Design a protein around this ligand. Sequence first.
Ligand SMILES: COc1cc2c(cc1Nc1ncc(C(N)=O)c(Nc3ccccc3)n1)CN(C)CC2
Ligand SMILES: COc1cc2c(cc1Nc1ncc(C(N)=O)c(Nc3ccccc3)n1)CN(C)CC2
Lengths: 289, 287
Amino acid sequence: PDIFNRDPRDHYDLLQRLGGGTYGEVFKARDKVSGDLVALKMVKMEPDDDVSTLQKEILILKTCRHANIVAYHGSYLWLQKLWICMEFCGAGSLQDIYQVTGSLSELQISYVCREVLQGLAYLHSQKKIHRDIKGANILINDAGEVRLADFGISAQIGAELARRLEFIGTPYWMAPEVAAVALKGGYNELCDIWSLGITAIELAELQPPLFDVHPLRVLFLMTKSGYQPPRLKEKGKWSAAFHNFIKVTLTKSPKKRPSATKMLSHQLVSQPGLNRGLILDLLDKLKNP
Amino acid sequence: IFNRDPRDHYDLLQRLGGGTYGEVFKARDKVSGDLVALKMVKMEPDDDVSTLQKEILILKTCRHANIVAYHGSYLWLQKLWICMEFCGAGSLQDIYQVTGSLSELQISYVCREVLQGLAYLHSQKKIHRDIKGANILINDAGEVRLADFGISAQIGAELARRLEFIGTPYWMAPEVAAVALKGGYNELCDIWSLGITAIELAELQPPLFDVHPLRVLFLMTKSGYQPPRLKEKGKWSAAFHNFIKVTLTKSPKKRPSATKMLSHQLVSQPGLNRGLILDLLDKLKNP
Ligand SMILES: COc1cc2c(cc1Nc1ncc(C(N)=O)c(Nc3ccccc3)n1)CN(C)CC2
Ligand SMILES: COc1cc2c(cc1Nc1ncc(C(N)=O)c(Nc3ccccc3)n1)CN(C)CC2
């Protein structure tokens, strides 16, 4: 992996802040000569970080190439700030879209779900977990194509990791099994399938289930023995295949819950007429209400 | 939970310490003159009073000699106060920082009393989650009490910090939520932590204290991870080395219970009593 030890401000002009958090910032940026629009993700680098692990993580981003995953172009390390140059998605997230357009149609949701599953089946074949499938992390380009934004780079380095360590507290008295869970958590690969189920409801209804209920209460209810997975609110609005998609994706037991490959053979996402045109209609609704 | 003012019951003397768990004061009883520890916990607006009542009933019922005694609770001006037994010599950390390292017999006594505390807690289906020198308290009689900060974790600032840390749960799968709440802590993790504490008391620091915490977490999770040991071999007996070996079993399935550990030579030997700690408190007063 060629991490360029140079200022990215020489190569790109930063236009507009798209978003950010503790990890750092993501900008819309223009290439100075070539004129390509890119997404430039600034990641804050703390002084006692392994450069070898950073190299392995950028190598993981370089090797992770797939149509439904946002493309990696290159890296810059300059003044304890890692910059990751990526594919720009000009319509933002599905969240940004649905907040203006209102709820997606069933065919639109079916197309989105197929493309996310294609993305997830690839990530799971590489022994990765997305960990955060939601409307806000599914990006849409001007062509109506679907890309997953991958925030996994911030987990292994920088301020997001430093904040995770502060929350976990001192580890010196902690047992191996407790340390294992502090790093990993409950995240396995099939948790992304659950999250997609919730996302499909989110796109259908403008909120995930229990969005107005307090988060601790939701967490307690999810962990009970007789917890009932959520459902679509209106039954008649949606077809039997869409209800079944939600039913199988929201299987409570991880052992019984179907994989991304399994889900790609489901009726909802395997039907004909699912293409980017459906999202071009959505982007037209956004522009001309 | 008494809706009276705790100012009517107690006068707050001196701040003992603080954190996310809350502020803790030394306080005197107005009538009886008895000294107590009053743990102030700030109440956030979206805290379930019904769950707080169920948690305090668990604290009220959990009575044992080696656990800090619960006297009562007072809710006044969006501040939960938890009145508890006072331990006038502070933590073992506060002590060893002045006295230096504990002797083997002193550590053996401490370990017996912690294990008595833990065997009780585990019989009640609880986990302490935080066994260390700073949370093992010593009264003026040289007796050993476990401080329980678990009550503060489910409400107030510690709850608000937990929720910020986990993030929004609405897209989260049941198995992921389960682990976000539980956090890997089972009952036998307290036995590991006591093993580390025994080294801490022996050497003034846990193992790997100068190593970065993330690095320690990674090393602990590797296949060939070697549990720590006491640095000096000749200073400590074979029974103390064995105590550290069995308590620091890597596999939770193979690691012995608190009841099992109470029959171990180190903690089952004669001459383990509070006198050992009264000598330590005398060393603290006159070095
Ligand atoms: C016109 O493009 C947008 C607009 C808005 C967003 C996003 C975009 N595009 C966009 N494309 C590509 C990426 C990428 N390679 O990861 C990205 N990342 C990103 C942005 C922000 C935060 C966190 C990650 N973002 C975000 N919304 C919150 C407000 C508007
Ligand atoms: C003279 O008593 C002390 C002195 C010092 C401390 C503690 C005590 N007593 C003491 N007794 C009982 C308790 C209890 N019901 O849980 C307690 N809580 C507590 C624990 C941890 C921290 C701060 C408070 N504290 C703490 N040290 C860190 C500094 C000095």
